[PDB]
Each structure stands twice: as structure tokens, then as C-alpha cells.
Amino acid sequence: HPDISVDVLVIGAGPTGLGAAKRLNQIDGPSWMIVDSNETPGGLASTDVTPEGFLYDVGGHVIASHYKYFDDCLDEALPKEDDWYTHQRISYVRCQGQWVPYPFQNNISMLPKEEQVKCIDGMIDAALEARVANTKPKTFDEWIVRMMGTGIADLFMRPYNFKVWAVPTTKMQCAWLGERVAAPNLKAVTTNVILGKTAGNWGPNATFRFPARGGTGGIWIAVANTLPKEKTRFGEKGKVTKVNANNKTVTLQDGTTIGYKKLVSTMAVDFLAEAMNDQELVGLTKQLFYSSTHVIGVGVRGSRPERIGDKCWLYFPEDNCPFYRATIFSNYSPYNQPEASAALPTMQLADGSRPQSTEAKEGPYWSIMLEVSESSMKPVNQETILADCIQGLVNTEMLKPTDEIVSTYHRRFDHGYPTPTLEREGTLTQILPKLQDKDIWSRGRFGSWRYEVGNQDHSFMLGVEAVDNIVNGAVELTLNYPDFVNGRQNTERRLVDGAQVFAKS
Amino acid sequence: HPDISVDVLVIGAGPTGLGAAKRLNQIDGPSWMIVDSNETPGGLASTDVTPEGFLYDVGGHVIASHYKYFDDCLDEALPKEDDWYTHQRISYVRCQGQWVPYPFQNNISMLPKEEQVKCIDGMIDAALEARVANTKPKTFDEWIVRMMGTGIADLFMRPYNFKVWAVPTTKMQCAWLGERVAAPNLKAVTTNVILGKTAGNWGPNATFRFPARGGTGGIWIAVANTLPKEKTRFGEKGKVTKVNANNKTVTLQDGTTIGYKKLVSTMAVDFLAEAMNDQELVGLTKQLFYSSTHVIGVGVRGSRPERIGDKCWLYFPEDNCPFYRATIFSNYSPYNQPEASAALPTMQLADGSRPQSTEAKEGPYWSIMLEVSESSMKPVNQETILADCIQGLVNTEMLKPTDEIVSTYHRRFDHGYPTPTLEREGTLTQILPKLQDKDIWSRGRFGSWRYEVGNQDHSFMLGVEAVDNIVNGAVELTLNYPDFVNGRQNTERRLVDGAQVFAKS
Amino acid sequence: HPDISVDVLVIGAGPTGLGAAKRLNQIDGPSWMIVDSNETPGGLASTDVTPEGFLYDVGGHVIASHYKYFDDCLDEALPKEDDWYTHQRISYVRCQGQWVPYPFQNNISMLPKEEQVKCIDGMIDAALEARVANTKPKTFDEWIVRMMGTGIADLFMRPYNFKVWAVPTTKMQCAWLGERVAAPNLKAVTTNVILGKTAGNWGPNATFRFPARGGTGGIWIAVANTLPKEKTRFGEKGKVTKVNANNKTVTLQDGTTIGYKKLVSTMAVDFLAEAMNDQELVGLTKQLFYSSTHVIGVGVRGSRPERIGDKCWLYFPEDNCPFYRATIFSNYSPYNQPEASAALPTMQLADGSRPQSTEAKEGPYWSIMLEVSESSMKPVNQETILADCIQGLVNTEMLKPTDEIVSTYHRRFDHGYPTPTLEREGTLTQILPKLQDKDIWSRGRFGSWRYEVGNQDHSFMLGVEAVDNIVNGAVELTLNYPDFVNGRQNTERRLVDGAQVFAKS
Ligand SMILES: Cc1cc2c(cc1C)N(C[C@H](O)[C@H](O)[C@H](O)COP(=O)(O)OP(=O)(O)OC[C@H]1O[C@@H](n3cnc4c(N)ncnc43)[C@H](O)[C@@H]1O)c1[nH]c(=O)[nH]c(=O)c1N2
Ligand SMILES: Cc1cc2c(cc1C)N(C[C@H](O)[C@H](O)[C@H](O)COP(=O)(O)OP(=O)(O)OC[C@H]1O[C@@H](n3cnc4c(N)ncnc43)[C@H](O)[C@@H]1O)c1[nH]c(=O)[nH]c(=O)c1N2
Ligand SMILES: Cc1cc2c(cc1C)N(C[C@H](O)[C@H](O)[C@H](O)COP(=O)(O)OP(=O)(O)OC[C@H]1O[C@@H](n3cnc4c(N)ncnc43)[C@H](O)[C@@H]1O)c1[nH]c(=O)[nH]c(=O)c1N2
Ligand SMILES: O=c1ccn([C@@H]2O[C@H](COP(=O)(O)OP(=O)(O)O)[C@@H](O)[C@H]2O)c(=O)[nH]1
Ligand SMILES: O=c1ccn([C@@H]2O[C@H](COP(=O)(O)OP(=O)(O)O)[C@@H](O)[C@H]2O)c(=O)[nH]1
Ligand SMILES: O=c1ccn([C@@H]2O[C@H](COP(=O)(O)OP(=O)(O)O)[C@@H](O)[C@H]2O)c(=O)[nH]1
Ligand SMILES: O=c1ccn([C@@H]2O[C@H](COP(=O)(O)OP(=O)(O)O)[C@@H](O)[C@H]2O)c(=O)[nH]1
């Protein structure tokens, strides 16, 4: 008989595991506990800080919630109005010296006329083709072409998506983009060209909120703190090293064993297979594909430059920079970087030269967070990637050669994106049911490996729904039907349901 | 304070209400009770018996379950093997003296050559227009013409559907029919014409099980029996006369008042509106449409005729008989009619004449169940409908003129089919949300008025899911997404969920 | 025995009759003769002159030859290089107070931005519908909507075409327009909108030559002069009043009778029917439709204004003027108006007011020629149309209010355009064969009533080909296959054929 026994064991306290935990805690029926190898909950939704005081999420993290239940927990965790800042969803695409508003096609009036011709001609071809299309596109690349046409494809989505996914667009499926037909809005695009008009898809309605303190990682610390502490086990004392599926026991690094009746695993499914010592599942999970993420942070002296302004995130299809995305992280919260009165020396200038002085000087400061993808089809030289990113910032005119850099940050996250390869579903529909047969709910960004339901809210709800399936027999909608949950009003499930209202009488 | 107070009150003990009751009973949290004006539960899924011992369902009732939860409750209620009979579906459409395998549109091969031409020609035209169509059909009639062509429309779909729906095809929408109306495939249908092959396998009820005793009504009597008796109130004592939505109070016929927190109402929603004395709702519910159903039963002396054989239910598009469907109800169970030793006099011959004597002779007996529709667009002579049905049986060669009729049955059910009119959804989205904001869950065949989820399993699950939404914040999937629940295997929710398993440990 | 007998009689000495005459004269086999009621040959290709010395054609006459035979005869008649002036076509459409290069539909790029959107949107709809179309358009309006879209239809094609044809586009067929109405290309037109480029080169009259003296009418005077005088009878002495098709006898106004073996009649076919006293033919001809043309000429004092420049003819779709077209007739030849030293009093100022002086003053002079259509569907006030035209010139800024008018011209031509009505062909295939049976070749603009082969070269060749059929069994290609002769270079028939070469030895 094991050291600890519980009805439901949750491995991992990133968003998915915390969702499972929040729902278990709310139901307050079956016994449970949650473990994690990190002392700080949050997983890939955590936040780091540099010795100079610049915070960085694991790349650009922007919340777009599809669920009331997620809103209920975030509101419970950070309830005061100044626990959050609200921003319009402002983004641009860097293209031929221009910051083109997102989405790219509605803004090609900024491009040279010769290119507008090429773009509109291709989109005309695509519209005429879409009018008689009776088949669905099979690859990401076929979907891009059919929706954008050849010309607009080549400028943005094709070279951009290679830089994100670190695999070619011809190697990915396209079901993950949803059930909407790959077709051009030719009239809308052509109208903006005729009118010489730009127009981004943001505004008063198209907002996001960002935590005032602690970056994105602050949310999940705050949510985890609503859990009964004695049911949590975070740190080296919570690292799972062995899973015995046939015996329903888990072993921690410090030798502690935990018995379960149902297991919600939120670790990477390939790590799970290894921890189970199941050669068959190991072989199957190795057939999946993922890219690694390098996050580069650069802290800059100065008030925010006019050329930067209220930009939030930025896309980089071109090859004059290694990053696919930049975030003006200082625009998300004033507490993402030191106050103006904090004194820091200049480490270097953006062109790489030494500062004129070594003295500490005051701010204010602003901050850029960059993402570089890595895979076997796209290597990354870890020794030079920081300097390459900074050169990238000059090339894209985000930084002047003279701009003063006061903080740098680089970290590699091995499992960054679960790739929607052509083979992904063929592999997962083998892996997930074999685990399901052993009472293991493998869920999450890498627990279930589905990017289209791979955001914080999706993840959290994957945990919530898993628990609901285990206890109340609910359908796991987010797991199995991404287009469905992403397209509907998910308002039925709440942090206080009927069951708790009736029980309290 | 009212006489009785429950958290959830369930009005009606047909399948929908019994569903709510079963789930409320399983969950065993909030207090509840269920009321019906009938002493015998079952609603339109009940069974009558004639004084001569012939049972008749409310028209042809064949179970095709889309849900494990529904299976669990039927199996609990009738757990023995000899509680059920299994049957292969044998279904035909009567057309020009011939029997055409169901579905008609997939069996053009059995028609005379000249009618095959008209049908295939129409289907070729439809196929070619459909290759370039980029707008969905609006009405049932447009859908028919666009999916099958004019030949099949005129020969079968238009007269048949007026004859069952009691409105023309032009008056109905076409989003309800995914699992009711087969779309013919040009190549497949033409291939079977050339090869002279049938294709009678389409649809969810190609196999079915029928209760050995009590008809369909036996199921719901048995299901109801599994509930705690003290939480039920069936009979005159349970007839709801007033619903006061603002006070959350219901008044029964005997003056008993029941206070509730949440109301699941499964009575026809137009009745509910009247009971609420809500003139705005009465006005809205009157924009809905329904047809009435006459059920005619005919008991016949003799061993089962060869021309009848293993036939299950039969469709009649033609105007030489008033009924749209006949069921060989004696094929569903030996106990739907008397044993062969039972002595019964002949009441009349099928040709309408008196028999020679009043002598009670033995059997065996077989039995036909007929349905005639009625509406404000399709009047029915109540006084002659029985004799008209019997003559229809002679015209269609179901009965020989000399056949000996030993029992007759006729009953009119005012609310038979909830009609999928063009206006339905526009009216329902004014009605159901209004009731919802008063904490009223109106659900079921006439409770929420949606035929595409209007079968026994559907109904049962509307009640189940309503409770699950009330207690556990579940999505009401069957109510809002018929194609979704009709096209998947719904296996997640069970009579015993983890909740009950864990609570017993 | 009649007064005169010839093998072939030609009625009319417009271009069609002269064509018949020239071919008969070249062949020099059958005896022949040509009559006209007018002392001066030319018909609708004649030229009038005002007492002040301003010449006016019957509206805008620009030669675009499809035939080497036609060129041969023009070169014979006017052999000197200084008999002709060559011009580049400068043609615009008046829209929203600006000039848009002809053709409108290829020059969307010169419209105001909001109309560019309207136009391109319509063309996009048309392109998408044309992608799946399997039916040919039946009316002119349907053709416009299908080839150009609603934007161009409403802004230009519908109002402009009513303004010329004097019937709505819905009343006309669309088989006539191959070389009359440019079909815009979506990609090309959109490209030129993006690039702000013009495309003014469409169609056969992008370059033209105009006779140096006598206007267009001078060509036909000179061509007629090459005919042997004794075989011509022009004037009151050559007016046909009765045609006796059965006795093959024509009666002239002075009572002179002419016997023929074959008749080539170039007069309006309705007039021919009347001259034949053939009530069945009259009824048939009355099913045809034509519009009348008002020609208004305005002579203006002054050197050619900068705003006019090298403009040739100009289209006016809008309602601030009654004419559909203006020609800068003084640009076609310096001899279309008086020399600069000619003294002429001012008749009026363009704004209607009397001149400051009544004295004769010098030039130079320029000259405007206007056209206004009339029909039973578009009445015209004969008494005010001159003044209305002049005011229209002020409205469109063709004339300053202070411009001095020294000459005015107004003439109504009752048969101006043979309308391509829906009924035209149905009617003509009754008429022309019934005349063919009587050995009458009815040919020409109103002789055979087909606008698509209704220009001077077409007409001329209808006469030539008529004769060639009578004598040599040639196919009448221009008559029966307009798209055939308009789409090729017709080089085979020359003013000197092998026949004449071989015979001269
Ligand atoms: C570059 C980039 C950019 C974005 C995003 C991610 C990345 C990488 N996201 C996605 C977001 O980060 C993601 O949805 C969640 O972090 C997924 O959480 P999971 O809990 O499934 O696992 P995740 O990897 O977060 O957490 C898993 C947890 O399991 C633990 N674990 C692993 N092995 C263990 C073991 N053996 N024993 C014990 N514990 C173990 C880990 O410590 C970790 O805490 C996002 N989201 C969004 O809402 N908006 C956005 O804009 C973005 N953008
Ligand atoms: C002709 C025909 C044919 C078929 C079918 C129906 C009909 C009419 N059905 C559908 C099936 O009958 C249906 O799904 C259920 O009976 C509907 O369940 P409810 O609980 O919604 O309504 P239903 O009408 O069954 O039950 C409502 C109940 O509420 C009660 N009630 C009404 N007013 C009240 C009041 N004032 N107070 C208290 N109680 C009140 C009534 O007494 C009744 O018992 C079927 N299904 C299938 O699975 N296979 C099939 O082939 C068919 N075919
Ligand atoms: C407003 C407008 C604009 C244009 C044009 C016309 C008009 C009205 N044309 C067309 C051109 O004018 C036309 O092609 C010829 O004039 C037609 O020659 P027909 O000989 O068939 O008849 P046409 O009518 O020219 O000649 C008929 C002859 O028959 C004679 N006649 C009638 N009744 C008679 C009787 N009872 N007895 C004896 N003789 C009789 C008449 O006197 C007349 O001479 C043109 N062409 C072109 O090449 N380029 C252009 O841009 C244009 N544009
Ligand atoms: O051969 C057939 C018989 C029926 N139907 C259609 O199927 C529908 C459902 O009838 P069914 O008898 O399966 O169900 P019920 O009327 O008993 O609810 C009808 O409305 C018909 O339009 C069909 O398309 N082909
Ligand atoms: O065959 C029918 C006859 C009537 N109704 C409904 O009944 C309403 C009329 O209600 P009223 O109480 O005025 O009763 P009725 O007019 O039928 O006598 C109509 O609006 C319809 O919605 C129906 O659905 N089917
Ligand atoms: O910009 C323009 C001007 C004219 N037309 C069409 O061209 C036809 C022929 O007109 P045009 O001035 O060539 O010849 P005409 O009327 O003098 O015979 C007209 O009926 C118009 O419908 C056109 O499509 N675009
Ligand atoms: O603008 C017009 C007016 C009349 N017509 C023709 O002239 C005939 C009418 O004849 P008319 O003016 O003699 O009157 P009606 O013969 O009917 O009395 C019509 O059938 C038309 O063919 C025409 O082509 N254009």
C-alpha cells in the first residue's frame, strides 16, 4: 500500500493541471492532490525576471478567453480592477520597410503598387478557384493559397509560418485552423486598395487584459493560491519520475509513492510514455513533432519611441531577423520593467559597441520580448542567437544603432509548440485511447498536443473538462471538438454551479 | 409558504420528464419531485389496449438510441433477455402496386423503367446544379428538388410529406433532416438501377429492439418504477393547472401548491404559456405549428399472410388510402395481441360487411397499426376515419375483402408532431430564452418543439441534460445541436458516473 | 414593254447602292442602272453646309474599313495624299465633370474613388458568376450585367444606351455588339485602377482618315463620279414611287417605267414594302424598330480653346445635356468650316443672350456637331432641341457662356439607327426571304436593318456582295455573318480581279 492515496491525481500545475484542480476543489467530492516539479506553478505560462528587473513571459502571451469558467477563476484570483491593465489588440506585420496592420491582406495599400497588382491578381485567381472548389484543402499550404492567393501567400503567411513552426507549410495539416472555408474576401481587400486605406482589426471591443504585476505568471500563482495548500506538492518533492499504469501508482523523485484511481497527466505525453516505461507508447509519441522556443528579452533605456508607440505584438516574415514575433512587453504593464528612478548601467549599444560610460543612469525603460523557433529542420546557434536578435532589431528599425541596452535575457524551452503535422492525428488517435484504457487522462498543450486548443484558456478547460468527465460524465468538448468550443458561447459551466448553491442550503 | 417545496420540480412523466427524474435520482443532491396528470407515465410513448386484447402504441415507435445513458436506464428498467425482441428493419414504400425498399430515393431500381427515367433525369439535373451551387436551400421543398430532383419530388417526396406533416413541403425549413431524409447519390442510385439491386440499409434504425410486453409503454412504466414513489405524483392529483413564474409556484388540480427553485417543464410549451397566464408567451407559442395524429388499430384473424411476412413498417405516399404509415405491430411482439387459443367473434369483414354469425372463433391473430395526420391545412373526418382506413387497407392489398376483423381502435392525439416550419426557430428563440430567464427549462417533443431531437432517446436526454445544466453546468447539447449529438456516439454520461463510485468509498 | 430594261436595277445611291453599282461596273457583264431621289449621292453618308459655310455630316462619321475592296474604291475616287487627313482617335466620356477615356468600362481608373469601388465590386460579382455560367445572355441588359456588373451598368451602360438607342437595354438583343461594346477584363481594369493608368486603345477606329474637302459626303460624290453617267439617274427624275414585284417593274415619279431581271433595293425596307403595295410586307416591316437622329451643328468664333484640343468625339451619359455625342468636327479638316479671314456676325452668345455688336468680324472658327436620339419611347421637342443643345454645351463646359455662335444647324433624319430589338431577327427572317423569292435583294443600313454591319464600309460591301451573289453565286457574308467579316481582314475581293486582268489580253 502506497505512501499517499487519492481518487484523482493531477500531475503538473501549469494552466491545465490548475484547471483540473480548481474543478476538483469546487466539486469537493473525490479526494485529490496536485504535484509539480517546479516550486512555482504556471508552466509555460510562467514569468521570468532578469537581475536588472525586466520581466519576460515565455514569449508573447495574450489572453483571449472562450469560457465563463476561466473568467470566473481569473476574476476570483485577481479581483481588484487594478490587478489588470486593458489594451487594444494592436499588431502589425513587418514588410519591406513598412509596419503593415494586421491582418496583412487588408492593408497591402502600404506596399508598392507593383506588388499590390501581384497580390490582387493572385487573390482574384483564388476567388475564381474558390467559386468552383468542391474539395477541402489537404495541407496548410493549400489552405493558405486558396484563402490568400499566390502573391499574398509569398509575402507573409508562407515565409512567416516556416519561421514560427520551423517546418514547411506543405508538411502541416489545416483542419486546426477550423471549419471556415479557405476563400478570399476579394471585395474587402480590393476596396481598401482602391481607397488607399489601412485598417487593423482592433478597437474598443477587441481588447485583452494583462496582469498588473508578475506578468502572466502572476495569474497562475494567484489561482494556485486559492487551492487548499496541503493538497499541493510543488518542487523537487513533487517531481514525478515513474508512472506504473498497471498498478496505478506514481513515484516522486524523493521516493514518495502515490496511489490513484484516475490520473490527469499534464506533462508532455512523450515524457509520460518514458515515465511509464511503455516501449509501445514511447515509439508512438516519438512519431509526434514539436518545435523548441527561444525567448530573447532586451531592456532598453529611454521613454518609449514614437516609432514604437502603442504596438503590442509584431510579425516578421522576412529573413533580416531570426525572430518570428516581437512583443513590446513594456506596453503590457508598467511593472514589467523597472521604474524610471532605478539606475542601471548600459551593457551595450544596439549595434554592439561599448557605452561611452560605465556609470549607472536612470530610466525610464522599455522592453522587447522576442521569439525564435528551433527544430531539426531549422537549427539555432544558441551561442550567437542573442546577438543575432539584437542585430535583427536594428535591421527591422525597432532599435536605432545608438539605442542603449540595459538588460538581456535568453532561455530555451525545449517543448514550445506542438506541431500540427499531417501525421499528428493519425498518431494521437492511437496514443490517447491506449492511455484512456488505463484510466489516464493525458491533457494539455503537450498532454494532448493540439495547438488549436493550446492557449491558456483551452488548457485550463482541458483540465476542467477532464475532471468533469471523470466525475460527472461530461463530454470533453475542448479536447475533441476545437471548432465547436472556439466558435460558441461557453457560458453554462461556472465556478459556482447549481450543485454548490443547493448544497449550501 | 406553499404546501410543498423542492429545488427542482419536473412537470410531466413522459420520456423527457422521466429523464430529468432519473438524473435527479442518480445525482441525489437537490430535492425534487415529478408530477403528471396521468396515473400511467409514458406520454406519447404509452400503449393502449382494446377490450379484445390488441395493444397499440401511439403510432409506430421504433427505438434507435444515440446515447449510452438511455441504454443504461432501459437496461436497468428491463434487465432480462426475454424482456426484449430484436428485429431487422423491413420497410417499404407502396408505389403503383409495388413495394419499394426504404428509402424510396435510394431504390429507384425497383420502379418501372419509365418512372426510373423521370427520377434519374431529375437527379442528373440536381447533380449538375449542385456542382455549382453556393447557397444553401431555404425550404424543405427546395432541399428536396436540389438533392433529388423534380422526378422524385413529384413521385414521392411532395405527396408523402404533405400526407405525414399535414403541411406542404414549401412551408417547412430543411435543417432538421440530416438523419431523417436520405440524400441520394447519383452514381450509387444509377448503378443499382443498371444492376437491378436494392439499397435498404440507410439510417439509424436498420435494427431495433422492442419490449416483449406492454408495448413501448412497458418501458416507461418500468423506468418510472425505479424512482422513489414518494417523489412522484401521478394522476388527477398531479395535474398542473397554474404556473406562477414570478413566485416560482405551481398549483395542481386539487389545490396543492409546489414551490420550486428551478422548473423543468415537459408539457407542450403552448399549454405552459396558458398555465402561466402570460399573454405575450401565449401569443408567441401560437406562432408555432403542430399536426395531430389519429392512430387506427385493426386486429385480424388468421396466421400471418405471406404477402405481409416480416414487414415492419410501410409508407403510403398515394391518395388511395388516408394513412401515411402502417406498422405490422404483431411482428414486434407475440404479446401485442391475443394467443391463438383466444376466442373472438368477427366484428366485420375488411370489405365492410357484417359477418355471417356472432360465433367466437379462435386465432391466431395479427395486427395493423395505422397513422393519419391532421392539421388546419388537412382536415380529417373523425366519424369515418376508421372505415376509410380499412378500405385503404383493401385498396393497398394489405387486407383481402374477406379478411376477418376482430378488433378496432381509434384515438386522436392533438399534439402529434411538432412541425419544423420556416418560422419555428425565429419563434423559439423568442420563447425558450424568456422562459430560461425565469428559471424555467421547457424541454421535450412539445416542451422545446424540435422534431430532429424528438424521439424517445432524444426526449429522455433533454430531461437528463436539463438537470445536468441546472446542477453541474453541463451544455445542453441535444437541445441546441441536433446534428452534433445525432452524429456521434454519446458514451460519456452513464447511469453510474465517477461521482457515485467515489461517494461509495 | 417598259421605257427602260436592265438586267440589274439598283435603287438608292448611298454607299450600299454605289457598292452595287461599282461591282456591276467592274464586272461589266449584265446591263445595269442606278437611281436615287436625291441629285447628290451619299444618303446618310452625305454632308450639309450652313449658309455661313460650316459643313456637317449626318452626325459623327468615322471610317473603319474591314475590306480591301472598299479601300480600293476610296483610293480610286480620292487618289491624292492631300485628299485626306489622318487622325489619332481622341475620345472621352463625360463623367462627374471630368473626362474619362473611351471606352468607359476599361478606364474605371479615371473615376472618383467611390465609383471605382462600385465598379470593381460589380465586376467581381460578374466574374464570379461568369465562372459557373452555362447559359448565354439573351438581352443587351443581361449581357451588360454579366460582362461588366451592376456598377458599370448603372453608372454608364444603362443610361448612356437609352440615350443613343432611344430604347432601354432590356428591349435589345446582344448578338450585335462584338466590335461595338468592349468587354472589360477584371484583372486589367483592376490593375489600371491600382496603377492609375489609362487604356484608350480598344476598337477598330483608334486611327482614322477623313476627307479633306466636302465632308464624308465628298467620298460618295467622288465614288459616284467614276460611274458611267448614262447609267445613273439622280434627282426627282430618279425617285421610285411604285414597285411591281410581280411584273418586275419599277415606276419613277415622272411616270418612267423600268423593267428588271434582278432588283437591289437599298431604300428603307419599310418604304420598299409601301412602294410594293404589299400589305403583308408592310405588317412585317412595322414589327421592326428604328430611332430618329437629330443633328445639331454649332459654329463658334475663336481659335480652338485649350479645353477642347485634339478631342475627336465625346460621349455624354449624364442628364445636363440632351445629346449623347459631340464631335469636334473642325478637327477633322480645316475645310469643314470657314477660313479665319471670313467675316461673320455673331448670331448669339452661348448663354442665349444677344451679341454686343451685330457687325461681321473675323475668325478663326471651330465647330461642334451634336447628336440627339428620338423614338416613340423617347420623344423630342423639335422646336426647342437646338436651344436645349446649346444650353447643354454650357452645362458641360464645352462652351463658355460668352462664346460667340456664328452659325447653327438642325436637321432631323427620320431613319437614323436600325434598332437591334429582341424581335429583329424573327422579323427579318420572314421579310428578307419573302423578298428574295421575288428576286429582290434588299440591302443596307435600312435595306437589311442590321446595325452590326451598318457602317459605310459594311453598307458598301452589302451592295457589292449582293451583286456578286446575283452574278457569281458568292456568299453574302456581310449580310448573314457579321462577326465573320468583322473579325477578319477581307482582302480577297479587289477593284481589279483576275477576271479583268485575264480579259485585258
Ligand atoms: C512561445 C509561446 C507563446 C504562447 C503560449 C506558449 C508558448 C510556448 N501560450 C500557451 C500557454 O503557455 C499554454 O496554453 C499553457 O502553458 C499550457 O499549459 P499546460 O498546463 O498544458 O502545460 P505546461 O507546459 O504549461 O505546464 C505543465 C506543467 O507540468 C509540469 N511538469 C512537467 N513534467 C513534470 C514531472 N515529471 N513531474 C511533475 N511536474 C511536471 C511542469 O513543471 C509544468 O508546470 C499562449 N496562451 C495564451 O492564452 N495566449 C498566448 O498569446 C499564448 N502564446
Ligand atoms: C406518431 C408518432 C410516432 C413516433 C413518436 C411519436 C408519435 C406521436 N415518437 C416520439 C416519442 O413519442 C416522443 O419522443 C416522446 O413521447 C416525447 O416525450 P415527452 O416527455 O417530451 O412528451 P410527451 O407528450 O411524451 O409526454 C408529456 C407528458 O407530460 C404530461 N403532461 C401534460 N400536461 C400536463 C399537466 N398540465 N400536468 C401534469 N402533467 C402534464 C403528459 O401527461 C405526458 O405524460 C417516437 N420515438 C422513438 O424513439 N421512435 C419512434 O419511431 C417514434 N415515432
Ligand atoms: C448618326 C449616324 C452616325 C454614323 C452613321 C449613320 C448615322 C445616322 N454611319 C452609317 C452610314 O451613314 C451608313 O452606313 C450608310 O449611310 C448607309 O448606306 P445605305 O446606302 O444602306 O443607305 P443610305 O440611307 O446612306 O442611302 C439610302 C439611299 O436611298 C435613296 N432612296 C431612298 N428612298 C428612295 C426612293 N423612293 N427612290 C429612289 N431612291 C431612294 C436615298 O436618297 C439614299 O440616298 C457611320 N458609318 C461609318 O463608316 N462610320 C461611322 O462612324 C458612322 N456613324
Ligand atoms: O422512403 C422514405 C420514407 C420517409 N422519408 C422521410 O423520412 C422522414 C421521417 O419519417 P420516419 O418515418 O423515419 O419518422 P417518423 O415520421 O415516424 O417520425 C419523413 O418525413 C420523410 O420525409 C424519406 O426521405 N424516404
Ligand atoms: O392544425 C393546427 C391547428 C392550430 N395550430 C395552432 O393553434 C393556434 C391557434 O390557437 P387558437 O387557441 O386561436 O385555437 P384555434 O385557432 O386552433 O381554434 C395557431 O396559431 C397554431 O399555432 C396548429 O399548430 N396546428
Ligand atoms: O465608352 C463607351 C462608349 C460607347 N459604348 C458602346 O458602344 C456602342 C457603339 O457606339 P459608337 O459611338 O461606337 O458607334 P455609333 O453609335 O456611332 O454607331 C454604344 O451603343 C455603346 O453602348 C461603350 O461600351 N463604352
Ligand atoms: O420611334 C419609332 C416610331 C415608330 N416606328 C415604327 O413605325 C411603326 C408604327 O407605325 P406608325 O407610326 O404608322 O403607326 P401605326 O402604323 O401603328 O398606325 C412601328 O411598328 C415601328 O416599327 C419605329 O421604328 N420607331
In A24-69, which ranges are E strands? 32-36, 47-49, 55-57
Q: What is the DSSP letter of A106?
A: G
Sign of CA dihedral C168, C174, C180, C182: positive
CA angle C230, C232, C235 (to 5 degrees): 125
Q: How far does Cα C91 stand from its chain's mean position?
A: 17
Find chains touching chain B: ≥3 CB pairs under 8 Å. Answer: A
Residues 126-185 of A with CB under 8 A from C: 127-128, 131-132
CATH homologous superfamily of B7-505: FAD/NAD(P)-binding domain (3.50.50.60)
Phi, psi of B14 (to 5 degrees): -80, -170
Is the separation of the CB atoms in A76 and A225 below 8 Å?
Answer: no
B255 to chain A, any CB pair closer than 8 A? The answer is no
Ligand number nearest CA of C156 is: 6
Residues of A in contact with B475 (CB under 8 A): 475, 477, 490, 492-493
Closest residue by Cα to atom 7, ligand 7, is: C286
Q: Which residues 6+ apart lie within 8 Å of B399 measured at CB?
A: B298, B300, B350, B390, B393
Residue whose C-alpha cell is 475645310: C335
DSSP string, B426-494: HHHHHHHHHHHTTTEEE-STTTT--GGG-SHHHHHHHHHHHHHHHHH----HHHH-HHHHHTS-B-S--
Pairing of strands B344-345, B360-361: antiparallel
Least distant ligand from the CA of A209: 1
DSSP codes of every residue in B186-233: HHHHHHHHHHT------STTSEEEEESSS-HHHHHHHHHHTS-GGGEE
Resolution (A): 2.3
Tell me which residue has cell 453541463: B474
Residues of C in contact with A186 (CB under 8 A): 124
Domain ranges within chain C, ordered by starting residue: 7-505
The cell numbers describing C437, all together, are 423569292
Which residue of A116, A124, A193 is in closest CB contact with C186?
A124
Whole-angstrom Cα distance, residue A322 to residue A378? 11
**Residues found in chain A:** 505
Which chain A residues have a beta carbon less than 8 Å from that of B496? none
H or E segment and range at residue B298: strand B290-301
What is the distance between the alpha carbons of residues B146 and A26, in angstroms, rounded to a whole number? 52
Q: Backbone phi, then psi, for A204, in 5-degree steps?
A: -50, -35
Output the nine-digit C-alpha cell for B423.
418560422
Minimal CA–CA distance to C56: which of C408, C458, C398?
C408
Residue pair B490/B69 in contact by the 8 Å Cβ criterion: yes
The helix/strand/coil state of C301 is strand
Mutate to test the pocket of ligand 2, among B220, B285, B455 (most ligand atoms within 8 A of CB): B455
Q: B498 and chain A: CB distance < 8 Å anywhere?
A: yes
**CB contact burial C372-393 (16+ within 10 A = b; e otherwise):** bbbbeebebeeeebbebbbbbb
Using CA atoms, how far apart are residues B37 and B22, in angstroms rounded to an integer?
19
DSSP state of C80: S
Choosing from B286, B288, B378, B451 the residue with most ligand 5 atoms within 8 A of its CB, the one to mutate for a pocket test is B286
CB contact under 8 A, A124 and C194: no
DSSP string, B103-130: SGGG-GGGS-HHHHHHHHHHHHHHHHHH
Which three cell numbers, joined as nine digits, stand for A432? 490517447
| Residue to probe by mutation, ligand 3, list C91, C164, C250, C266, most atoms within 8 Å of CB | C266
User: How far lies B495's CA from each of A378, A408, C178, in Å?
Assistant: 52, 58, 75
Q: How far is CA B308 from the centre of its chain?
A: 23
Among A45, A55, A157, which residue's Cα sits nearest to residue A455? A45
Q: Contact, C7 vs C435, CB < 8 A?
A: no
Check if the beta carbon of residue B184 is closer than 8 Å to that of residue B153.
no
Q: Which of A97, A62, A83 is nearest to A313 (CA)?
A: A62
Q: Do A475 and B498 touch (CB under 8 A)?
A: no
Alpha carbons within 13 A on the beta-carbon side of A362? 4
Q: Cα B242 to chain center, whole Å? A: 28
| Residue nearest atom 6 in ligand 4 by C-alpha distance | B181
Q: Give yes or no for residue B12 CB within 6 A of ligand 2.
A: yes
Residue type, B412: R
Strands A313-315 and A257-265: unpaired
Say whether A444 sits in a helix, a strand or coil.
Answer: coil
Contact of C481 with C40, CB cutoff 8 Å: no
Tally of residues, chain C: 505
Cα B6 from Cα B32, distance rounded (Å) = 5
All residues of chain A having their beta carbon less than 8 Å from the beta carbon of residue C116 are 194
List all residues 6 or more positions away from B218 whose beta carbon is below 8 Å from its beta carbon.
B47, B78, B211
8 Å CB contact between B186 and B123: yes
Contact C460, C283 (CB under 8 A): no
- Strand A404-418 to B4-11 pairing: unpaired
Tell me if C1 is assigned to a ligand binding site: no
d(CA C447, CA B384): 76
Phi then psi for residue A22, to 5 deg, are -60, -35
Q: Determine if residue A309 is left, alpha or beta; phi over 0 gives left, psi from -120 to 50 gives alpha, anything else beta.
A: left
Q: Tell me if residue C109 falls in helix, strand or coil.
A: helix
On whether B185 is known to bind a ligand per the annotation, the reply is no
First and final C-alpha spacing in chain B: 39
Distance separating alpha carbons of residues B327 and B59, to the nearest angstrom:
8
Give dist(CA C472, CA C161) in Å, integer: 40
| Backbone φ and ψ of A411, nearest 5° | -145, 140
Greatest Cα-to-Cα distance within chain B, rounded to the nearest angstrom:
75
Rounded Cα distance, B363 and B53, in Å: 12
| Chain A CA closest to residue C109 | A194
DSSP string, C164-204: HHSS-GGGB-SSS-TTTS----HHHHHHHHHHT------ST
Specify the length of chain B in residues: 505
d(CA B54, CA B212): 14
Rounded-to-integer distance, Cα B15 and Cα B41, Å: 8
Return the closest-CA partner of residue C293 out of C396, C370, C407, C181: C370
Which residues lie closer than 8 Å to B359 by C-beta, 6 or more apart?
B345
Alpha-carbon torsion A205, A210, A211, A216, what sign? Answer: positive
Decide: A217 in ligand 1 pocket, CB within 6 A. Answer: no
Query: What does the buried/exposed string (b/e) look like for C194-233 if buried means 16 or more CB atoms within 10 Å of the residue's CB?
Result: beeeebbebebbeebbbbbbbbbbbbbbbbbeebeeeebb
CA distance B462 to C299: 88
Using the beta-carbon criterion (under 8 Å), do A470 and B134 form an inter-chain contact? no
Asked whether the beta carbons of residue A128 and residue C127 sit closer than 8 angstroms, the reply is yes
DSSP reduced 3-state for A99: strand
Q: Is the dihedral of CA B302, B305, B309, B315 positive or negative?
A: negative
Rounded to the nearest angstrom, the distance between the alpha carbon of B286 and the centre of ligand 5 is 6
Taking each helix axis from N to C terminus, what angle separates A113-132 and C113-130, rounded to the nearest 10 degrees? 30
Residue where the block lists cell 465556478: A495
Question: How many A from CA of C458 to the centre of ligand 2?
Answer: 81
CB atoms within 10 A of CB B29: 17
